[PDB]
Design a binder for these strands. Structure first.
Lengths: 125, 138
RNA sequence: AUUGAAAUC
RNA sequence: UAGUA
RNA sequence: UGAAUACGUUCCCGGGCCUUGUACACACCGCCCGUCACGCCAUGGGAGCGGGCUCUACCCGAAGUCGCCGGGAGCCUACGGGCAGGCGCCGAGGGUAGGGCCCGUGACUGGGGCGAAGUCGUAACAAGGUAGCUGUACCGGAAGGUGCGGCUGGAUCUUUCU
RNA sequence: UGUGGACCCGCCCCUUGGGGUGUGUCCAAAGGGCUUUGCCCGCUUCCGGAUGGGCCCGCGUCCCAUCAGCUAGUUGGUGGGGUAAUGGCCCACCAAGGCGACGACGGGUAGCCGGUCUGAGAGGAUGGCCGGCCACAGGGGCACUGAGACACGGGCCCCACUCCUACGGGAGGCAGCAGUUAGGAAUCUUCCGCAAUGGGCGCAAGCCUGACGGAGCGACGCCGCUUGGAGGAAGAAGCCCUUCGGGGUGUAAACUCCUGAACCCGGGACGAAACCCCCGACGAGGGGACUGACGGUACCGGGGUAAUAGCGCCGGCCAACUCCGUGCCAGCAGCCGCGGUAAUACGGAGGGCGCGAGCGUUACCCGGAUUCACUGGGCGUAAAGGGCGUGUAGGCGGCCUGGGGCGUCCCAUGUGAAAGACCACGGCUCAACCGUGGGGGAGCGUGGGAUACGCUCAGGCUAGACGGUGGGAGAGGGUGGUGGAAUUCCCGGAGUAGCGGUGAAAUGCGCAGAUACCGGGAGGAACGCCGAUGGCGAAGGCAGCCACCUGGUCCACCCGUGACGCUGAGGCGCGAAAGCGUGGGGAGCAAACCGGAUUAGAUACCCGGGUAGUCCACGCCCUAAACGAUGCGCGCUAGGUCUCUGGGUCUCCUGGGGGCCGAAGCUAACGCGU
């Protein structure tokens, strides 16, 4: 564009927006479950992928994924959401933090332990 | 009519040299002359001279190249590899003496118009004056 | 059973 | 008919 | 012991070289479009009940500053004036009526996105089997079909589906 | 009492209400203590100083134009009110103004800065802590006191709320420090001390100070330090692999020496010398006394124990690989992608890589992203040229001279507080932290100076543009008129059994005599050959022939004017086909529709019919593969060849168009290439 043009019009800050309405910035949000289901994934994958619907203290209601190999979550469970999508489950854009509130850590979990919220075992100690 | 007589000139020169013409005209202005003498003095053109063609004043600019080169494509190296207008009528450009640019670790030059007159960058640095950053060559 | 399946006996 | 070069 | 027949290369099948077009490369047993059906998701129109901001007009108007009175109608007086008190203008706000705007809910309702193997066909890609796209206009379960004009970003001197 | 000052008036200087002077008027005061006749703390009026403020102006300061028009104290005036003071700040009256695309009005969002983070930089993002300014003190008004307020812990009234209540009426305001509660993913002790610094009052002694100075809590951040040091096998066991010999964890451990974080005892701060007293003179100077929260902490000396390691990762990007388990399951996944019985990608173990009192995760900001491109990008086919013009504001402007010095440049000077950043040196054992010093700097003000470029003013010039005269080609447009071919229909002659249509048929039409043939007539629409790779137009678009009205354009002469130029947001005009309104017209064709076929079906392709429409007048509609998918103008940069139209010396030259091939160059390529 001519300079006169730029002078008349300027440029424009593209500022594309949040992938996570966990509202008020909020690195995490607290929520209560509503529905714990199981979901068929997509694209080229197959498995019974676990996931919850959550009523949010931000006023929102979102499906959030339940990581870990097995879980203790039913209807009125009250949980903490962390964000991070699934990818194979379209429309799932938040994860549940394991080991906070009524969502237990994962049992018999030895490797990537701080994720999955599983305390240090003393079995080798 | 012509929108930038100076820029047109730099171009006429640019265009002539790439087909290796021995000479070019450019219609004549005193300000054009003043730029030419720099190119001349600083070794980019063999020289200019005034002529009147079809009854009107032009400046015949005599271009200057290298030796016929070796392998496939013997075309000579250009003496003027890069002549470029800076302060166009659209966006006028002015450096003060502190901001006068040094074209190409010195191997270049920047014709630059001041109240002390049309100057190279070192000339103007030495005279201690800034002005309209006209163009640059190398 | 067939091919890893879906379908199908 | 889905995954698969 | 011992035939018949081959003009010919249009057609069926398999193949060879050149060239073209291609949205194919799992390579035409390829690709691919739309309705309908199922499931998650966000969204649009929406009469009426409700929540607020705002504008104009008319009326009521606290506190207070200011203005007038301040009397044979009260208190002080050196009679000059002061104070109480009273009236008024403005004025936070409020009420009545009328427009403009936002929030929510909202039965009925329009489509849209996404979802390993559901349904009907076969629009498009090879001249895709009626060249295709296109503005418009009418029509049809669905892709679409036709009309008028335009474009080349078309090859060429009997029948669907994987 | 009037040093003096205030006010009216006059005059002088000076220039907005600044200083001076002269009659007239008006205005002061407070006392207290003693080391009581001589000092101290105060009082009054005035001029000045320092400090702190009020007000005004230039420039700068986010998002939406899907906010384009706003405005009655509105804009100005005159006179008043009001204030410390200007001012529509407020009031009375007069005038009719003021603001807006350079974005007013409206909506959304937001305290602003020094600076902070990030970036090579330009820039982006940000404004917590510290410093400056501002604004608020449950929400809304308001005034009083006073040097100062329209006052967080002052006042009055309305509102909501909480408590008291004899229901008449009252009380209150942590966004001070703590702490409670609620919201939340989340944020501390109802701590010590006025010892220091600082503030208030006081002559002083002192009193007050949740400012402050400290301790507390929280890996929340930065820095320092610890979990040992040196020996120690061809290498214990255990576990992991294994081709069954072997390989690994691994000098790692065990074990021997050595030092000695923690912990014990001893000692023990600087931070604090002033105000005060005495001497001197309540001055200068000299002397003395009191006082430490942190704290029995820091630091010093002695003793002394081998004394904590986790978290992430190992398919590619990216540094690190084997074995089981699992079988599109369970699960992983930042992107690309892993898992369907041999998975370096899942879960586990061994091993390895990376960090280390941390390591990961999520959120947000800068980066990379030249991915809003000022530095620093683009639009033939990738996203991107407006369907075409006309010309409004706006941007941009040929050659020569002179004036002005607005842009621009140079010199000096003022400002740019502190902190921070940066360089040095220094103080805590280092560092983090801190201190002292130094160095720059845009930007803006003031004075001076330069004049090349840009601007402006005044002249000039003719190469750009426009014009003059002469000549040219043209489906350029508008209006009327006219011509021949063909189709359909009507009339006549003649003539007879079919025509038509298809792949093949059938619907259809035909003895009320069609088709084929000849003659006459009516009507509509379109113009064969010329016709082109051609011409015109700004596009859309334009095609028989004639006449009139009219636009553009090209050449030659080189005659006129003198830069009159280019572009163009908005505006306005034009704008194929389809479509809409009113009214005509209606041959042929033909969406829809009615039939016949075909087909698995066939709302289609083929056949037979057929309404709107196509044609005209007027008014709408304003779209398109409105395509060269290429905006306008100008200068410059090899040629060959075909062609339309001018001019000239006419094998060639010279203009203006239309095409192809192609120099240089360009392009991702295809291509583009006077």
């Amino acid at each position: 564009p001519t300079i006169n043009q730029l002078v008349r019009k300027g440029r424009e800050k593209v500022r594309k927006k949040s992938k996570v309405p966990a509202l008020k910035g909020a690195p995490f949000r607290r929520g209560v479950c509503t529905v714990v289901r199981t979901v068929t994934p997509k694209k080229p994958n197959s498995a019974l992928r676990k996931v919850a619907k959550v009523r949010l203290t931000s006023g929102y209601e979102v499906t959030a994924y339940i990581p870990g190999e097995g879980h203790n979550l039913q209807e009125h469970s009250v949980v903490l959401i962390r964000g991070g999508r699934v990818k194979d489950l379209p429309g799932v854009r938040y994860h549940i933090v394991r080991g906070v509130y009524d969502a237990a850590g994962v049992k018999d979990r030895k490797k990537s332990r701080s994720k999955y919220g599983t305390k240090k075992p003393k079995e080798a100690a | 009519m012509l929108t930038d007589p100076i820029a047109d000139m730099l171009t006429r020169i640019r265009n002539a040299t790439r087909v290796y013409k021995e000479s070019t005209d450019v219609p004549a202005s005193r300000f054009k002359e003043e730029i030419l003498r720099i190119l001349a003095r600083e070794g980019f053109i063999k020289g200019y001279e005034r002529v009147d063609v079809d009854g009107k004043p032009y400046l015949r600019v005599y271009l200057k190249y290298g030796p016929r080169r070796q392998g496939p494509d013997p075309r000579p190296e250009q003496v003027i590899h890069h002549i470029r207008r800076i302060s166009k009528p659209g966006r006028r450009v002015y450096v003060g003496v502190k901001e006068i640019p040094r074209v190409r670790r010195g191997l270049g030059i920047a014709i630059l118009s001041t109240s002390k007159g049309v100057l190279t960058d070192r000339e103007a640095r030495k005279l201690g004056v800034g002005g309209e950053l006209i163009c640059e060559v190398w």
